[PDB]
PDB file of C-alpha atoms and ligand atoms in Angstrom:
ATOM      1  CA  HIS A   1      61.160 -45.995   1.535  1.00 11.50           C
ATOM      2  CA  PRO A   2      60.776 -42.442   2.875  1.00  8.39           C
ATOM      3  CA  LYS A   3      57.278 -41.346   3.888  1.00 10.46           C
ATOM      4  CA  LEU A   4      56.029 -37.986   5.167  1.00 13.52           C
ATOM      5  CA  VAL A   5      56.246 -38.001   8.975  1.00 12.01           C
ATOM      6  CA  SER A   6      55.056 -34.427   9.542  1.00 10.23           C
ATOM      7  CA  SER A   7      54.871 -30.963   7.995  1.00 11.95           C
ATOM      8  CA  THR A   8      54.314 -27.287   8.770  1.00 11.14           C
ATOM      9  CA  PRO A   9      51.612 -26.404   7.897  1.00 11.77           C
ATOM     10  CA  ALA A  10      50.042 -29.801   8.571  1.00 11.77           C
ATOM     11  CA  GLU A  11      47.724 -31.647   6.191  1.00 12.35           C
ATOM     12  CA  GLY A  12      44.227 -30.113   6.267  1.00 12.31           C
ATOM     13  CA  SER A  13      45.332 -27.217   8.489  1.00  8.25           C
ATOM     14  CA  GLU A  14      43.833 -23.735   8.222  1.00  7.09           C
ATOM     15  CA  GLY A  15      45.654 -20.663   9.514  1.00  4.92           C
ATOM     16  CA  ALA A  16      48.000 -17.774   8.801  1.00  6.90           C
ATOM     17  CA  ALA A  17      50.351 -17.635   5.824  1.00  4.77           C
ATOM     18  CA  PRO A  18      53.533 -19.618   6.553  1.00  4.26           C
ATOM     19  CA  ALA A  19      56.846 -17.874   5.812  1.00  2.00           C
ATOM     20  CA  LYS A  20      58.116 -21.266   4.663  1.00  2.00           C
ATOM     21  CA  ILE A  21      56.819 -24.820   4.338  1.00  2.00           C
ATOM     22  CA  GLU A  22      58.728 -27.658   6.018  1.00  2.00           C
ATOM     23  CA  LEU A  23      58.322 -31.335   5.195  1.00  2.00           C
ATOM     24  CA  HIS A  24      59.859 -33.934   7.516  1.00  2.00           C
ATOM     25  CA  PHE A  25      60.516 -37.447   6.190  1.00  2.00           C
ATOM     26  CA  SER A  26      61.368 -40.793   7.811  1.00  2.00           C
ATOM     27  CA  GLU A  27      64.535 -41.222   5.724  1.00  2.00           C
ATOM     28  CA  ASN A  28      67.453 -39.022   4.621  1.00  2.00           C
ATOM     29  CA  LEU A  29      66.908 -37.580   1.140  1.00  2.00           C
ATOM     30  CA  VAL A  30      69.266 -37.262  -1.809  1.00  2.00           C
ATOM     31  CA  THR A  31      69.041 -33.508  -2.431  1.00  2.00           C
ATOM     32  CA  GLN A  32      69.685 -33.654  -6.183  1.00  2.00           C
ATOM     33  CA  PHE A  33      66.876 -36.185  -6.837  1.00  2.00           C
ATOM     34  CA  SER A  34      64.382 -34.845  -4.282  1.00  2.00           C
ATOM     35  CA  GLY A  35      62.176 -31.765  -4.698  1.00  2.00           C
ATOM     36  CA  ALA A  36      58.694 -30.239  -4.690  1.00  2.00           C
ATOM     37  CA  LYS A  37      56.224 -27.837  -6.308  1.00  2.00           C
ATOM     38  CA  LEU A  38      53.752 -25.472  -4.619  1.00  2.00           C
ATOM     39  CA  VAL A  39      50.350 -24.935  -6.243  1.00  2.00           C
ATOM     40  CA  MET A  40      47.411 -22.678  -5.421  1.00  2.00           C
ATOM     41  CA  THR A  41      44.285 -24.707  -6.200  1.00  2.00           C
ATOM     42  CA  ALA A  42      41.796 -22.021  -5.104  1.00  2.00           C
ATOM     43  CA  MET A  43      41.373 -18.498  -3.701  1.00  2.00           C
ATOM     44  CA  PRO A  44      38.361 -16.645  -2.222  1.00  2.00           C
ATOM     45  CA  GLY A  45      35.562 -15.732  -4.649  1.00  2.00           C
ATOM     46  CA  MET A  46      36.996 -17.530  -7.690  1.00  2.00           C
ATOM     47  CA  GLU A  47      36.637 -20.959  -9.307  1.00  2.00           C
ATOM     48  CA  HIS A  48      39.174 -23.712  -8.624  1.00  2.00           C
ATOM     49  CA  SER A  49      42.164 -23.358 -10.949  1.00  2.00           C
ATOM     50  CA  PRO A  50      45.595 -24.974 -10.350  1.00  2.00           C
ATOM     51  CA  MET A  51      48.526 -22.575 -10.676  1.00  2.00           C
ATOM     52  CA  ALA A  52      52.218 -22.991  -9.840  1.00  2.00           C
ATOM     53  CA  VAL A  53      53.432 -20.685  -7.063  1.00  2.00           C
ATOM     54  CA  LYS A  54      56.833 -19.039  -7.501  1.00  2.00           C
ATOM     55  CA  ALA A  55      58.897 -20.682  -4.778  1.00  2.00           C
ATOM     56  CA  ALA A  56      62.344 -22.069  -3.947  1.00  2.00           C
ATOM     57  CA  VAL A  57      62.993 -25.560  -2.580  1.00  2.00           C
ATOM     58  CA  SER A  58      65.988 -26.674  -0.511  1.00  2.00           C
ATOM     59  CA  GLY A  59      66.954 -29.216   2.122  1.00  2.00           C
ATOM     60  CA  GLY A  60      67.161 -27.874   5.675  1.00  2.00           C
ATOM     61  CA  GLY A  61      70.049 -28.607   8.024  1.00  2.00           C
ATOM     62  CA  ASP A  62      68.400 -31.976   8.579  1.00  2.00           C
ATOM     63  CA  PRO A  63      68.767 -34.314   5.542  1.00  2.00           C
ATOM     64  CA  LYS A  64      65.237 -35.569   6.402  1.00  2.00           C
ATOM     65  CA  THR A  65      63.702 -32.094   6.014  1.00  2.00           C
ATOM     66  CA  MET A  66      62.563 -30.363   2.815  1.00  2.00           C
ATOM     67  CA  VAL A  67      61.975 -26.601   2.892  1.00  2.00           C
ATOM     68  CA  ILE A  68      59.772 -24.748   0.382  1.00  2.00           C
ATOM     69  CA  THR A  69      59.962 -20.944   0.517  1.00  2.00           C
ATOM     70  CA  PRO A  70      57.518 -18.728  -1.465  1.00  2.00           C
ATOM     71  CA  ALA A  71      59.043 -15.837  -3.453  1.00  2.00           C
ATOM     72  CA  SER A  72      56.452 -13.600  -1.802  1.00  2.00           C
ATOM     73  CA  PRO A  73      54.024 -14.139   1.107  1.00  2.00           C
ATOM     74  CA  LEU A  74      51.111 -16.454   0.299  1.00  2.00           C
ATOM     75  CA  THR A  75      47.706 -14.788   0.019  1.00  2.00           C
ATOM     76  CA  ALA A  76      44.396 -16.364   1.058  1.00  2.00           C
ATOM     77  CA  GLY A  77      43.498 -19.640  -0.634  1.00  2.00           C
ATOM     78  CA  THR A  78      43.926 -23.403  -0.715  1.00  2.00           C
ATOM     79  CA  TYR A  79      47.400 -24.723  -1.539  1.00  2.00           C
ATOM     80  CA  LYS A  80      49.018 -28.087  -2.248  1.00  2.00           C
ATOM     81  CA  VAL A  81      52.666 -29.125  -2.014  1.00  2.00           C
ATOM     82  CA  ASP A  82      53.513 -31.927  -4.457  1.00  2.00           C
ATOM     83  CA  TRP A  83      56.747 -33.443  -3.120  1.00  2.00           C
ATOM     84  CA  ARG A  84      59.232 -35.992  -4.473  1.00  2.00           C
ATOM     85  CA  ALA A  85      61.322 -37.892  -1.885  1.00  2.00           C
ATOM     86  CA  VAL A  86      64.297 -39.995  -3.036  1.00  2.00           C
ATOM     87  CA  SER A  87      66.584 -41.783  -0.545  1.00  2.00           C
ATOM     88  CA  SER A  88      69.745 -43.678  -1.601  1.00  2.00           C
ATOM     89  CA  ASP A  89      69.190 -46.776  -3.781  1.00  2.00           C
ATOM     90  CA  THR A  90      65.423 -46.357  -3.341  1.00  2.00           C
ATOM     91  CA  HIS A  91      62.517 -45.799  -5.759  1.00  2.00           C
ATOM     92  CA  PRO A  92      61.194 -42.209  -5.790  1.00  2.00           C
ATOM     93  CA  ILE A  93      58.195 -41.644  -3.507  1.00  2.00           C
ATOM     94  CA  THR A  94      55.626 -38.914  -4.216  1.00  2.00           C
ATOM     95  CA  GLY A  95      52.779 -37.357  -2.261  1.00  2.00           C
ATOM     96  CA  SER A  96      50.727 -34.219  -1.793  1.00  2.00           C
ATOM     97  CA  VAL A  97      50.135 -31.972   1.233  1.00  2.00           C
ATOM     98  CA  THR A  98      47.158 -29.582   1.148  1.00  2.00           C
ATOM     99  CA  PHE A  99      46.410 -26.618   3.455  1.00  2.00           C
ATOM    100  CA  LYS A 100      44.407 -23.376   3.539  1.00  2.00           C
ATOM    101  CA  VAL A 101      45.627 -19.812   4.077  1.00  2.00           C
ATOM    102  CA  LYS A 102      43.299 -17.165   5.522  1.00  2.00           C
TER     103      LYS A 102
HETATM  104 CU1   CU B 201      47.108 -17.918  -7.253  1.00  2.00          CU
HETATM  105 CU1   CU B 202      41.907 -15.665  -8.838  1.00  2.00          CU
HETATM  106 CU1   CU B 203      60.827 -49.210  -3.888  1.00  2.00          CU
END
């Protein structure tokens, strides 16, 4: 089964707004069954409130890499990437990556 090897930004990281989010998995993904959603869970001065972020999701050049690209630059707040990794003849695997933008 594919598991999340690494990502940019990394889990728990705090830093600048990423132009795109990259997820690297241990196994090659089937593009049509794999995917992800980006959510803002919080922003400065306001209560926690999950909201889908307008973003596109595609495989990279590497079949083990998933790329999420926001429609517009991410503003300050906490974000989570809920991903769905499906390799060939394998049960779907899901997970969540969280990170903060300042
Ligand atoms: Cu928001
Ligand atoms: Cu708000
Ligand atoms: Cu399985």
